[PDB]
Write a protein that binds this ligand. Structure first.
Ligand SMILES: [K+]
Ligand SMILES: [K+]
Ligand SMILES: [K+]
Ligand SMILES: [K+]
Ligand SMILES: [K+]
Ligand SMILES: [K+]
Ligand SMILES: [K+]
Ligand SMILES: [K+]
Ligand SMILES: [K+]
Ligand SMILES: [K+]
Ligand SMILES: [K+]
Ligand SMILES: [K+]
Ligand SMILES: [K+]
Ligand SMILES: [K+]
Ligand SMILES: [K+]
Ligand SMILES: [K+]
Ligand SMILES: [K+]
Ligand SMILES: [K+]
Ligand SMILES: [K+]
Ligand SMILES: [K+]
Ligand SMILES: [K+]
Ligand SMILES: [K+]
Ligand SMILES: [K+]
Ligand SMILES: [K+]
Ligand SMILES: [K+]
Ligand SMILES: [K+]
Ligand SMILES: [K+]
Ligand SMILES: [K+]
Ligand SMILES: [K+]
Ligand SMILES: [K+]
Ligand SMILES: [K+]
Ligand SMILES: [K+]
Ligand SMILES: [K+]
Ligand SMILES: [K+]
Ligand SMILES: [K+]
Ligand SMILES: [Mg+2]
Ligand SMILES: [Mg+2]
Ligand SMILES: [Mg+2]
Ligand SMILES: [Mg+2]
Ligand SMILES: [Mg+2]
Ligand SMILES: [Mg+2]
Ligand SMILES: [Mg+2]
Ligand SMILES: [Mg+2]
Ligand SMILES: [Mg+2]
Ligand SMILES: [Mg+2]
Ligand SMILES: [Mg+2]
Ligand SMILES: [Mg+2]
Ligand SMILES: [Mg+2]
Ligand SMILES: [Mg+2]
Ligand SMILES: [Mg+2]
Ligand SMILES: [Mg+2]
Ligand SMILES: [Mg+2]
Ligand SMILES: [Mg+2]
Ligand SMILES: [Mg+2]
Ligand SMILES: [Mg+2]
Ligand SMILES: [Mg+2]
Ligand SMILES: [Mg+2]
Ligand SMILES: [Mg+2]
Ligand SMILES: [Mg+2]
Lengths: 147, 164, 131, 97
RNA sequence: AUACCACACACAAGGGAUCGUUUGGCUCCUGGGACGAGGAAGGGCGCAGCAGAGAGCGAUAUGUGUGGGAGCAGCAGCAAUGACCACACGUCCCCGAAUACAGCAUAGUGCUGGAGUACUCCUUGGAAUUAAGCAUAUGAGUAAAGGAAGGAAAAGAAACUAACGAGGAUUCCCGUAGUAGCGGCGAGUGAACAGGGAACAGUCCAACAGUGUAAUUCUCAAAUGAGAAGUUGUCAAAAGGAAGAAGAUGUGAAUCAGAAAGAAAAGCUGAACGAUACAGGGUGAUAGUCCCGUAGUGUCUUCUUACAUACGGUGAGUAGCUGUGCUCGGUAAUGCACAGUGAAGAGGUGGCAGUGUGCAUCUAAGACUAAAUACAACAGGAGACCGAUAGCAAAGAAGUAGGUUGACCGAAAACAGUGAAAUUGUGUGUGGACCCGAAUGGAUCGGGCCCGUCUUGAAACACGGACCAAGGAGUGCACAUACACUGCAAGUUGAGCAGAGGAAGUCUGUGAGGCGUAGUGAAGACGGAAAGCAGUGUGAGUGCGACCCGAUAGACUUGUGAACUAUA
RNA sequence: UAGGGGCGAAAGACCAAUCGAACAGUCUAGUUGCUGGUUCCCUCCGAAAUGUCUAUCAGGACAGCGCGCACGCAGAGAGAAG
């Protein structure tokens, strides 16, 4: 629902506000923040967060996100990049489509699934998996590497 | 601390921290509008904004996209037959720090200069323009678009010879 | 509707402006309508009531009465009209003050500067009426 | 995570541009030559008027005994940079000759 | 129970709750940002026909000029020979930087000092607190204390990023990002380039000034002379303008009558009339036409702003190095200092120490700069804010009455409305602490220990509570989360910002980024299942005063005290 | 002669009814695993005072026992017979 009354409004008239008579509601009974984790809170850490207390891995003091950013597509989705009206033309037509993945912000092609239509296609990208290359060549298509 | 959560990390410990609210947003927008309007009267026939070059964006992530830059280089201006003092008088921006390193980048910026020169119109006095009822251009001049292109088709014999 | 944003529409501000008025602004509070005939004898539609002028009371206890203005109380905004009074337990009689807007002028006192005051207002109209 | 998917080989590719050659600036005008001459001249007069400094004397003495590697170490500690040391040794050597 | 004690009801006392009202407060936005040796800010003392406080003003203590025009609030007297108001000017006692002074510059005249300091710049520099203890670390380069300036201040045109097919001063907004990293690798901390915008602007000095004559600046004279500064080096050109903005002020439509009733009609009833004006205020009850305005229209006054000469490639106790102390996310040194040592004319940099070598990009150790950005006093406009125990401490002579030896500390009180409860007197009734169940003409019968709270356990010889009114305690924001509801869906979104529009609302664009569309490893590298995004709310975790109240303590000041008491 | 300082024929005495570390004001609404309080009605369901680890023993966390929403569904705090 888009709106509902709160619990606090029902607790008017009941002594302890739902915190108990014996236990009460004190200020900080367990400590502040995420502290105590090697000591009295060891059971919470070993159950939910086992890889917290450690150092790991190779270090580079400065990294650049733009130099490493990439996005991946599978062969089964190649025909899907075209508009539905465009798909329905190339399905019947005698011509071969020329699809450039760079134009949709994809740089690497993966070998997942089968091609939607079993007719030739030209695919342009920066990198192909070994499975992807074999699948495209199977239908008489061509893989073109480009920057 | 109890139950399963992503471990906290909220940075509100520092008692000297300042808060910035934005209740002034609609009013400051209205002031910026009114300053542009009055500035536009002071130079009535002329556009409020200068002409700027087209450059290519920086990293591997943005190579395939073109953008506006700061100013034309002394070489671009000279190649289109103008001199630096004249270019300023006609509302072209200048940047003497930039260098040219490609044939393509130079050729495109020369086209912009020649196009702009051709679309201009000159007047002796302000009153002449006023009497002709000239309406002054607003916004940026000849901005790039960077649309997504369209899927080209090719005949099976071509596939062996060109590769898209 | 009001489109000028320099003028206030606050109840608190309008009320303070009324009661704390001084000088010429105080005189504006003492205006009354003229009768139909006087509005042909002179150009003006309304004037500030002064001693010696002749007025018909058009609202209240003393409705229908006519008489001469005796006094003008500026601090407590009221006019005293000859023959409008109440009698105390003592038999002593006290004039009761009437608010300016409940009166209407029947004859003008033309003593002193009144003729120049009227002239000044008529000219101020025509100056813009004829343009 | 949209990071670290390409190999280093494919990241190294590049688009085939057409380059412009750099405009060389080798010509040096008459007035620029005289300007440089006068500065180099002035540097002579100072050396003639005031002579060498204490560490320069100590350095040149070691060069006469062929104590090349001692002189190298000494100069490194005085000037800080191993490049400045290599340059100053070459200038001092030429002065003695 | 004649008269005491209790309860109920009527009347009179006693108190000031409740409801109705408000020339005050608070918050947001816009303008403004105006002091002083020509004596300021702040303190004291005087001035009225009757005058204490407060307001106003200086021995001229209501004077002059301009524009207006009717009374001066009480009593006595004044006033078209100008009552009163508004704009400017003249006069302006004593103390106080307080100066017949101190320091300092010029040929000479002079300038500084004190006040204010919310916002900006430069120094100096804590502790409480968090780590469930505590010492490194955190709070925090924050508080406190000092110096300085303006309407803004600081910064600013690369000894700059980047490795792309590259860009191109500074500042500000969206974002990269709670990331790369720093850290008893604990608690916790934490930037930069890109990509989308607002606003846009570049220039000076030194190096390096006519030698057929310092051509340069100043003073007195004079109509063409004397003298000072300067060769340890002076001297490198334009008037000019209409626009733009803010205030002040003039004008400005249209109604009368009536039964009943009331102290009073503007209500109610009938008949009219205005509108580019039905925003709002005042009138004896709720008014378009009774009064002041409003929509629409006129005038006038201030302020802001604009054309000329000559040049380059070497700016030293500096950059750097060794030791040392502080600092930063900066990690085998990010920035800043001190002592030793100390360059080259060619040098600096490319987030990990060293040596060599190509390549790319820049030019330090001298200066100036608009716009876009921040926020007190004072002025103006608004509000789903508060309504006299609230809202500022302060709706009246409030930083006042009053108080400290001193630094410093600090109230109450609205309407001549309404008039509750506690509590008191008188009269009339009913009972002997009172409640629940059941009744009589009438004696009474049966059942019940004092509530709230910690506790295995309270009627307790456990604690809090004499009585009544009013006030009085799980809230706001950020970040992940599960559920319910809504739109679209391999996609999704109110980023900022622009265009329209009598406008803090709404509508439309342009257009980033983020998360999703499949995972595995420290990584090189490899790849093969699972609807999401953005909101409206609820339960719940963490950080901030964090449900409300409460320590003994610690630190910091260019703050105060030897009137009591100790000793010379 | 003034506060981590004074002054003392010495008692930790005295320094404005305050001294085994003065007063004023600020940081500061310092902190609290400890004591006190925490404001309307009816309907339905309904506990625990035990185990492991803890500078842990007047406190926590994890598990066990409640409630809400519930995809779904042959089971049972009892007997026989081997
Ligand atoms: K809640
Ligand atoms: K609870
Ligand atoms: K409790
Ligand atoms: K610990
Ligand atoms: K807009
Ligand atoms: K000063
Ligand atoms: K602690
Ligand atoms: K603690
Ligand atoms: K602080
Ligand atoms: K400045
Ligand atoms: K500067
Ligand atoms: K920059
Ligand atoms: K930009
Ligand atoms: K009117
Ligand atoms: K009437
Ligand atoms: K009236
Ligand atoms: K330089
Ligand atoms: K130095
Ligand atoms: K500079
Ligand atoms: K008060
Ligand atoms: K006082
Ligand atoms: K009252
Ligand atoms: K009363
Ligand atoms: K208790
Ligand atoms: K007992
Ligand atoms: K107790
Ligand atoms: K909370
Ligand atoms: K406290
Ligand atoms: K003694
Ligand atoms: K004592
Ligand atoms: K002390
Ligand atoms: K405890
Ligand atoms: K039950
Ligand atoms: K225990
Ligand atoms: K649990
Ligand atoms: Mg608990
Ligand atoms: Mg317990
Ligand atoms: Mg990699
Ligand atoms: Mg490349
Ligand atoms: Mg402690
Ligand atoms: Mg620290
Ligand atoms: Mg820090
Ligand atoms: Mg401070
Ligand atoms: Mg020069
Ligand atoms: Mg009324
Ligand atoms: Mg540090
Ligand atoms: Mg480094
Ligand atoms: Mg009230
Ligand atoms: Mg109050
Ligand atoms: Mg006293
Ligand atoms: Mg016990
Ligand atoms: Mg008691
Ligand atoms: Mg109450
Ligand atoms: Mg994020
Ligand atoms: Mg998939
Ligand atoms: Mg509290
Ligand atoms: Mg301590
Ligand atoms: Mg137990
Ligand atoms: Mg207890």
């Amino acid at each position: 629902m888009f709106n509902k009354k709160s619990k606090s409004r029902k607790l008017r008239g009941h002594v302890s506000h739902g915190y108990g008579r014996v236990g009460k509601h004190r200020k900080h009974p367990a400590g502040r923040g995420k502290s105590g984790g090697l000591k009295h809170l060891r059971s919470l850490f070993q159950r939910y967060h086992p890889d917290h207390f450690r150092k790991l891995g190779i270090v580079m003091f400065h990294r650049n996100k733009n130099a490493d950013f990439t996005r991946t597509v599978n062969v089964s989705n190649l025909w899907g990049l075209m508009k539905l009206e465009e798909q329905m033309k190339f399905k019947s037509s005698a011509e071969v489509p020329v699809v450039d993945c760079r134009n949709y912000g994809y740089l690497k092609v993966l070998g997942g699934g089968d091609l939607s239509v079993k007719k030739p296609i030209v695919v342009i990208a920066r990198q192909f998996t070994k499975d992807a290359e074999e699948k495209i060549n199977a239908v008489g298509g061509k893989c073109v590497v480009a920057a | 601390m109890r139950g399963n959560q992503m471990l906290p990390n909220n940075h509100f410990n520092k008692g000297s921290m300042k808060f910035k609210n934005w209740f002034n947003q609609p009013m400051r927008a209205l002031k910026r509008k009114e300053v542009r309007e009055q500035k536009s009267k002071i130079c009535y026939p002329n556009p409020l904004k200068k002409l700027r070059p087209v450059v290519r964006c920086c990293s591997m992530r943005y190579n395939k996209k073109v953008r506006l830059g700061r100013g034309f280089t002394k070489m671009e201006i000279e190649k289109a037959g103008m001199d630096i003092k004249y270019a300023i008088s006609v509302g072209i921006a200048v940047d003497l720090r930039r260098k040219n390193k490609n044939e393509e980048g130079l050729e495109e910026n020369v086209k912009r200069l020649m196009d702009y020169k051709n679309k201009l119109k000159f007047f002796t006095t302000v009153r002449e323009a006023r009497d002709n009822k000239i309406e002054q251009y607003k916004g940026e001049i000849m901005k790039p678009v960077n649309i997504i292109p369209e899927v080209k088709g090719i005949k099976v014999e071509e596939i062996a010879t060109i590769y898209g | 509707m009001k489109f000028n944003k320099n003028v206030t529409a606050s109840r608190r501000k309008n009320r303070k402006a009324h009661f704390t008025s001084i000088g010429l602004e105080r005189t504006k509070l003492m205006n009354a309508p003229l009768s139909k005939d006087l509005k042909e004898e002179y150009g003006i539609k309304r004037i500030a009531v002064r001693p010696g002028d002749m007025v018909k009371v058009v609202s209240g206890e003393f409705k229908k009465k006519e008489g001469v203005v005796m006094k003008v109380n500026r601090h407590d905004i009221k006019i005293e009209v000859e023959g409008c009074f109440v009698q105390k337990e003592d038999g002593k009689k006290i004039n009761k003050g009437i608010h300016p807007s409940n009166l209407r002028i029947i004859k003008l006192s033309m003593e002193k500067d009144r003729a120049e005051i009227i002239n000044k207002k008529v000219e101020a109209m025509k100056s813009e009426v004829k343009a | 995570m949209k990071i670290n998917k390409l190999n280093n080989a494919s990241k190294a590719l590049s688009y085939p541009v057409k380059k412009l050659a750099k405009t060389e600036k080798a010509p040096l005008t008459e007035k620029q030559q005289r300007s440089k001459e006068l500065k180099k001249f002035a540097m002579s007069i100072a050396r003639e008027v005031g002579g060498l400094a204490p560490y320069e004397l100590r350095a040149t003495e070691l060069l006469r005994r062929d104590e090349d590697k001692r002189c190298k170490k000494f100069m490194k500690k005085r000037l800080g940079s191993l490049k400045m040391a290599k340059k100053k040794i070459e200038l001092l050597a030429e002065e003695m000759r």
